[PDB]
Amino acid sequence: SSMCRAASLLPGTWQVTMTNEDGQTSQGQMHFQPRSPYTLDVKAQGTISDGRPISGKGKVTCKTPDTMDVDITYPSLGNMKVQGQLTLDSPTQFKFDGTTSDGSKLTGTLQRQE
Numbered sequence: 001s002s003m004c005r006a007a008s009l010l011p012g013t014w015q016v017t018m019t020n021e022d023g024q025t026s027q028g029q030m031h032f033q034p035r036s037p038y039t040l041d042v043k044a045q046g047t048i049s050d051g052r053p054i055s056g057k058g059k060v061t062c063k064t065p066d067t068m069d070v071d072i073t074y075p076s077l078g079n080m081k082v083q084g085q086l087t088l089d090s091p092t093q094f095k096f097d098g099t100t101s102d103g104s105k106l107t108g109t110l111q112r113q114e
Contacts, residue, residue, distance in 0.1 A: 003037045004062035006088045010040055014094065014110035021105040030110060038062045044072055044082075060086060070098055082106070 002008040010032040018026045028046030035041045044056040058072035066088035074080050084098015084106065096108035 001037070002034070002062070004068070005065045006068045006086065006094070007034075007038070007040055007060070007062050009088060009091050010060065010068070010086075010094070013113040015113045016044070016046075016096075016108055016110050018096070018106055018108040020100075029113070032060065035059065040068075042070070042072060044074075056082070058082075070096065086110070 011034055012032060014030045014032070016028050016030045026046060026048075028044060031043045031045075032040045033043075039059050039061045042058050042060050046054050048054050054074065054076050056072045056074035056077070058070070060068040060070055063069045063085065068086040070082065070084040070086055072082040074082070081101040082098055084096055087095040087097070089095050092112035094110035096106070096110060098106050100106060
């Protein structure tokens with residue numbers, strides 16, 4: 001129950017795969033918990049270059065019925081930010097297009113993890 005369909009379908013865990021402009025990729029998990037009928041809290045978990053786990057936290061906000069605004073901060077990575085947009089493709093898949101605080105153009109896929 002939320003004020004936009006994407007926020008209604010987002011709660012839970014998603015397997016996330018990311019690609020930047022230079023072809024580098026990454027993978028991890030993103031967890032969404034309801035914060036308000038317009039917003040959810042997002043927690044991103046991942047691993048860098050064969051070892052150190054890295055996490056970030058932020059919020060996603062209703063943008064359109066099927067799109068959300070994305071604002072995440074990664075304190076363990078110099079407090080760098082990831083801003084973007086989540087697009088509802090199916091109840092089991094979201095699409096991400098955004099940027100980092102350094103200027104990296106990122107695209108990603110969120111696959112529903114039960």
